[PDB]
Amino acid sequence: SPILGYWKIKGLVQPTRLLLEYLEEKYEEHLYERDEGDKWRNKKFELGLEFPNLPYYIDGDVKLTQSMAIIRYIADKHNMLGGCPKERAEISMLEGAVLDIRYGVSRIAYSKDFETLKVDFLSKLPEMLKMFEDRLCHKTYLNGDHVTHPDFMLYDALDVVLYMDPMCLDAFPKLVCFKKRIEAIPQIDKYLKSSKYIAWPLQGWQATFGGGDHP
């Protein structure tokens, strides 16, 4: 049974959790609490990891880091990355465009100047969301009729960005509607209501935005 190691936060790994749950995949978690950085520094080089980091995925022999390699791998095992170069690259484009939002948040969230940097990010964010709103015009999910992993990436980014600004989706009905549709997927619905859902923090606990024990 594979292992997903990460902090007990949403952060980089939350979209991978959602995808594991959507595929009804078994996995145990190594969850590093806020006060358990020492427990991590003590396992870091003892896991057989060639690029030691968090998150890590361990599928006995397959010993993986980098959250994007991990999410893509799980999708790969279920044959969900694309059937030719073209489709594979559209998925990788969806992927990276979502990351522009999610990393956009992460890159300012630990800054002393978070509050002012917030203004410049929320100015840009409508252009970014519009690309996704247009893609979902006549298209149920990001890649058509079936879920792919960038759907869960997008879901995660909308969730996070709605804490930063509760009104940032009011111009984007198809995006509001996408977020609900992911929530209605029976597997996802059971997970978000379960003991395993980590509601908070969005970021590391020490962050100006999305940190702390509670919202």
Place this chain on the structure above:
Amino acid sequence: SPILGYWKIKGLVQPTRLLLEYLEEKYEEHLYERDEGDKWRNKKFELGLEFPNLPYYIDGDVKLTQSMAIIRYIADKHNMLGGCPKERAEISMLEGAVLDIRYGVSRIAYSKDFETLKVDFLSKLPEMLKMFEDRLCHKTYLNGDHVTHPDFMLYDALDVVLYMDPMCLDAFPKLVCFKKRIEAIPQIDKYLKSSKYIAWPLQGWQATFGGGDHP
């Protein structure tokens, strides 16, 4: 004949250029000069691009953005991404670990506080480089005997990081040796000596680090 659009800078796209040259691939470039931001704002939505950005790749019907989707696509056309989920994920791990360095630089390079932020990045950088030095112990390239696209990604990151600190490879002989080996690849050697090589800037021209018309 496909088109690679980008600023006339190294930036996000330089590793893709290197890979196109290694594969002896034909491509014309759209190169946005420093003073040509208006020329770009005027083509941005007229290219058939669903997530308009720079870089973009256009392979007639295939209309792509996001530099990581683009680099991976070109490699895909040459069957270089991996033959099973396992190998595909190792490549994606190599990829992302290199990006930790390259984005690590980009994320501070435009900051007012660049010079102090530089200190904290160069403190971390030896741990990051050590993972690559260890991987290249008994292994010619990052993935064994053959070049894969993360090799050119690593090359780009070493080049950039050596401007930040000319001595940052003095503890890492196998990495110094990797950088030279890429330079000795006949295709790469011809490109770096050619009119097409864009030596500078490393970043956008407005950057504190790696900017300006000249080094």
